[PDB]
Design a protein around this ligand. Structure first.
Ligand SMILES: COC(=O)CCNCc1ccccc1-n1ncc2c(N3CCN(c4cc(F)ccc4OC)CC3)ncnc21
Ligand SMILES: CCCCCCCC/C=C/CCCCCCCC(=O)OC[C@H](O)CO
Ligand SMILES: CCCCCCCC/C=C/CCCCCCCC(=O)OC[C@H](O)CO
Length: 468
């Protein structure tokens, strides 16, 4: 606890990327009908026959999904940037992609080009994939050890705030209209121009400068400013230790992450935690929501979702104030457990949907409580924890692997779930309850507490476990 404006500024400017990721994730839902009308008109205006609903659904599905494909590629490409350019400059450099993607999506209507929309979603996907790796890596290396998890939770906060804002902007009376939806999608350009202006005044990680570039006194002076104290000897020395370790060790690529015994457990934890986020059922809960919301008298679908967005935000903040006290294990487990209870309730309330006339209110309650438990742990923790499971040398390759598995599992779930729901119906949530319980067991037996521990302490403990 040594928090000056500089540290806040640096972390806040970095979480613009988190906001960007959240915004582009949530922005696409509301304007579906409007964009399909655009796609139809683009073909009709040629004088051609109007497209079938099958073709529209097809093009629309590609628009949505190609974003994930971009993210898979970008998140796995994180390793190409962070050691070569640094952590701060990597973020500055890739804003080219955010500007590019936003231009395509923003100009696709006036250019009357469905192809530009699809292309824009791919490029903004690439950008967001790089962000999901760059931001926690930067925050992790620049935060005081006692606040590493708290600050790391600001990544997820930026993401959920980004989602909320995109949804609100998606309202018909704001930017969600026939004449304003290019502005809706094009909006992502503005935070990029703001971030690029602000970033050069954010310092590079002192850890990176000292450990990777051997610039000790440069790191110290920066460390003194960020933590607002002249005595930073304990931290500077701990960085010297990590630096000595890295120059005595072979620097790991992706493939060797899996050949080294002392890396196997950390990397397996990292991947599994990414899965515990995307296979939680969090992507199934809303698939049903939009239709459950009608039955309960909402008759206002985006409004039902925005409300969930507020709950989404509140419990991310709750997680922020808990993660340094309760620890990562406890918050992850509690969240997994509460989601297990809610998904089970979802199955029951849906199975009794029309034998009893109150069940739609029950399902909504289950959905909101589900969202709350998701953000307690499984939402924010898996993003910043892999940065904690590794020291300086293998972190970049580890975050490329972890991040990719997160984006990939998200993509596969979205591909496979509609089928599963079609064959299992209400029982599909029981499958997630099984996943959630299994993940809960994994965390309880296999995931060490990382709260307040130095990277060196954590790594040595993994080395000790590997020696027997
Ligand atoms: C298809 O549009 C959307 O997914 C928006 C869904 N509604 C957002 C919403 C509103 C209210 C409450 C909770 C939520 N959610 N829901 C999921 C969700 C979430 N995750 C789960 C999925 N993820 C993700 C989504 C993508 F697209 C592409 C790539 C992704 O990771 C690589 C990242 C973290 N985090 C916070 N709130 C969330
Ligand atoms: C209908 C309205 C049309 C007019 C609209 C005018 C907007 C002008 C541009 C604003 C740039 C947006 C910047 C987004 C700020 C990102 C928030 C953030 O950085 O997150 C804070 C915290 O770190 C999270 O954890
Ligand atoms: C009717 C009897 C009254 C009981 C009704 C209960 C209803 C379901 C409650 C779910 C809350 C979720 C709790 C999460 C459980 C996970 C356990 C956990 O988090 O363990 C932490 C660990 O001990 C740290 O080291």
């Amino acid at each position: 606890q040594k928090v000056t404006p500089a540290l806040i500024f640096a972390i806040t400017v970095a979480t613009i990327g988190s906001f960007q990721f959240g915004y582009n994730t949530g922005v696409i839902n509301a304007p579906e009908k409007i964009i399909k009308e655009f796609i139809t008109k683009t073909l009709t205006d040629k004088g051609n026959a109007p497209p079938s609903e099958v073709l529209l659904t097809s093009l629309w599905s590609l628009s949505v999904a190609i974003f994930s494909v971009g993210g898979m590629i970008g998140s796995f490409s994180v390793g190409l940037f962070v050691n070569r350019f640094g952590r701060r400059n990597s973020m500055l450099i890739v804003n080219l992609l955010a500007v590019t993607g936003g231009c395509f999506m923003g100009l696709c209507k006036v250019a009357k080009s469905v192809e530009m929309l699809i292309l824009g979603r791919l490029v903004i996907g690439l950008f967001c994939g790089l962000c999901t790796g760059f931001v926690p890596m930067y925050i992790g290396e620049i935060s005081p050890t006692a606040l590493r998890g708290a600050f790391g939770t600001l990544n997820q906060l930026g993401i959920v705030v980004g989602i909320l804002v995109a949804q609100i902007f998606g309202l018909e009376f704001i930017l969600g209209s026939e004449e304003l939806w290019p502005l809706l999608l094009g909006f992502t350009i503005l935070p990029a121009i703001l971030q690029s202006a602000a970033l050069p005044f954010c310092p590079e990680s002192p850890r990176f400068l000292l450990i990777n570039r051997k610039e000790e006194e440069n790191a110290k002076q920066i460390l003194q400013r960020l933590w607002g104290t002249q005595d930073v000897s304990q931290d500077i020395q701990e960085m010297k230790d990590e630096s000595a370790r890295m120059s005595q060790e072979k620097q790991v690529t992706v493939l060797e992450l899996f050949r080294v015994s002392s890396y196997r457990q950390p990397i397996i934890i990292s991947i599994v935690l990414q899965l515990s986020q995307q296979l939680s059922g969090i992507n199934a809960v809303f698939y049903y929501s939009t239709g459950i919301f009608k039955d309960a008298g909402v008759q206002e679908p985006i409004y039902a979702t925005i409300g969930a967005g507020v709950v989404n935000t509140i419990f991310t903040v709750v997680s922020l104030f808990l993660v340094e006290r309760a620890g990562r294990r406890t918050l992850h487990m509690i969240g997994l457990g509460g989601m297990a209870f809610c998904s089970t309730l979802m199955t029951v309330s849906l199975l009794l949907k029309d034998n009893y006339n109150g069940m739609s209110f029950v399902c909504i309650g289950a959905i909101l409580v589900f969202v709350a438990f998701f953000e307690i742990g499984p939402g924010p923790i898996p993003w910043f924890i892999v940065a904690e499971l590794f020291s300086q040398g293998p972190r970049p390759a580890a975050m490329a692997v972890a991040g990719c598995s997160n984006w990939t599992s998200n993509f596969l779930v979205g591909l496979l779930f509609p089928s599963a729901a079609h064959y299992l119906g209400a029982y599909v949530f029981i499958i997630f309850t099984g996943f959630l319980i299994t993940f809960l067991a994994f965390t309880f037996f296999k995931v060490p507490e990382t709260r307040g521990r130095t990277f060196e302490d954590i790594t040595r403990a993994f080395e000790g476990q590997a020696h027997g």
